[PDB]
Amino acid sequence: DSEAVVPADAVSFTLLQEQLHSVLDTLSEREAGVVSMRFGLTDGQPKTLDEIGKVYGVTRERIRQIESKTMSKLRHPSRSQVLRDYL
DNA sequence: GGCGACCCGGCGCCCGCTACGGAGTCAACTACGGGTAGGGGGTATCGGGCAACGCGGCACTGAACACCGTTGTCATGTGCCTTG
């Protein structure tokens, strides 16, 4: 069957979740939060940049600028060795 | 007319696992009518990229004072020489 949850894949996904969440915890609180909402780690629906700029109280271009800032920071080789292997 | 065999159905099972071949199938027709489903066409709505402002760290503004620190300064005290 195809509907079976392969234990190896499920456990790898859980480990990826934990490692990624730790990596965001390395980032600043606001930066980690905004990138999380932009990619919906907390909830299955990611929020657009303007969509993030309502609960947090930032403007769509301001939140956009920090989204660019988050993507850069997670792109430095520091917080990249761990997540390269998980793909 | 309940016993009785007998008859019959009817059923029930028939050690363990791995490991180990392939495969794949004979007989209507057309007309309509709708409804949906897709196609492009065009349109309101949401999202991403630049100019003006605000900060914020520090930095300069040294300017204006302060902190030691220094050789200015000195009227006023020991030591030798001359005279009582």
mmCIF file with all atom_site columns, C-alpha atoms (C1' of nucleotides) in Angstrom, chain A residues 49-50 60-61 64, chain B residues 46-50:
data_model
loop_
_atom_site.group_PDB
_atom_site.id
_atom_site.type_symbol
_atom_site.label_atom_id
_atom_site.label_alt_id
_atom_site.label_comp_id
_atom_site.label_asym_id
_atom_site.label_entity_id
_atom_site.label_seq_id
_atom_site.pdbx_PDB_ins_code
_atom_site.Cartn_x
_atom_site.Cartn_y
_atom_site.Cartn_z
_atom_site.occupancy
_atom_site.B_iso_or_equiv
_atom_site.pdbx_formal_charge
_atom_site.auth_seq_id
_atom_site.auth_comp_id
_atom_site.auth_asym_id
_atom_site.auth_atom_id
_atom_site.pdbx_PDB_model_num
ATOM 1  C CA    . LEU A 1 49 ? 3.949  39.411 4.179  1.00 0.00 ? 49 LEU A CA    1
ATOM 2  C CA    . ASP A 1 50 ? 1.084  41.890 4.479  1.00 0.00 ? 50 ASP A CA    1
ATOM 3  C CA    . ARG A 1 60 ? 3.909  45.031 4.485  1.00 0.00 ? 60 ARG A CA    1
ATOM 4  C CA    . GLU A 1 61 ? 7.177  46.520 3.223  1.00 0.00 ? 61 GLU A CA    1
ATOM 5  C CA    . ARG A 1 64 ? 8.967  42.160 3.792  1.00 0.00 ? 64 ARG A CA    1
ATOM 6  C "C1'" . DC  B 2 46 ? -3.862 41.401 -3.697 1.00 0.00 ? 46 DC  B "C1'" 1
ATOM 7  C "C1'" . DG  B 2 47 ? 1.578  41.493 -3.548 1.00 0.00 ? 47 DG  B "C1'" 1
ATOM 8  C "C1'" . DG  B 2 48 ? 6.136  42.916 -4.602 1.00 0.00 ? 48 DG  B "C1'" 1
ATOM 9  C "C1'" . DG  B 2 49 ? 9.690  47.130 -5.572 1.00 0.00 ? 49 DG  B "C1'" 1
ATOM 10 C "C1'" . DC  B 2 50 ? 11.308 52.124 -4.994 1.00 0.00 ? 50 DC  B "C1'" 1
#
